[PDB]
């Protein structure tokens, strides 16, 4: 690590809407506000709602029948 070459790099707090606070060293300078972090992202409860397979004959018989 040279002296004048690299940019500033300091400990910065990161708060998400998950309710998790994170002390991270980064180049953002000021504080940091998150919308989605790792622990809140709909990645483990989303693999079904982000595909939405369904069934057309079920849709039809629910729509009507004999």
């Amino acid at each position: 690590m040279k002296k004048d070459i690299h940019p500033k790099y300091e400990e910065i707090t990161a708060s998400c809407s998950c309710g998790n606070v994170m002390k991270i060293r980064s180049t953002v300078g000021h504080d940091l506000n998150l919308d989605v972090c790792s622990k809140c992202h709909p990645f483990f409860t989303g693999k079904q709602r982000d595909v939405a397979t369904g069934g057309r004959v079920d849709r039809f018989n629910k729509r009507f029948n004999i």
């Binding site: 809407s17 919308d35 982000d50 595909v51 939405a52």
Partner: protein, 116 residues
């Protein structure tokens, strides 16, 4: 100024701002704002973060860009694999809803290709 994976303009009123999302038009946006108790005259600037988190909640209650485009594309593809009339129409790129094609099909056919 960032909801549902898209950045939203920050000076325009909240209704238009939310219409900037793919899958949210004017009526859907008014519904979002009503359900979140946010006024319409306010812009995304000058709006507290808890409010924007409620907005995120509502937009997540709906179906938006990723899921939406996946649904749209999957339906189009279902048609084109079924090979029904709409399927062939989609594959060949002509109007599906029954419009005329003798003339005036330029939205599906792009600019005119001169015969050579």
């Amino acid at each position: 100024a960032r909801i549902a994976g898209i950045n939203i303009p920050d000076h325009k009123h909240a209704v238009i701002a939310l219409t900037s999302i793919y899958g949210v038009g004017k009526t859907r946006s008014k519904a979002i704002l009503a359900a979140a108790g946010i006024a319409e005259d306010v812009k995304i600037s000058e709006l507290s973060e808890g409010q924007i988190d409620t907005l995120r909640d509502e937009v997540a209650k709906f179906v938006v860009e990723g899921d939406l485009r996946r649904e749209i594309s999957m339906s189009i593809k279902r048609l084109m694999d079924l090979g029904c009339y709409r399927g062939l129409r989609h594959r060949r790129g002509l109007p599906v809803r029954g419009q005329r094609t003798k003339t005036n099909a330029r939205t599906r056919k792009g600019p005119r290709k001169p015969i050579k």
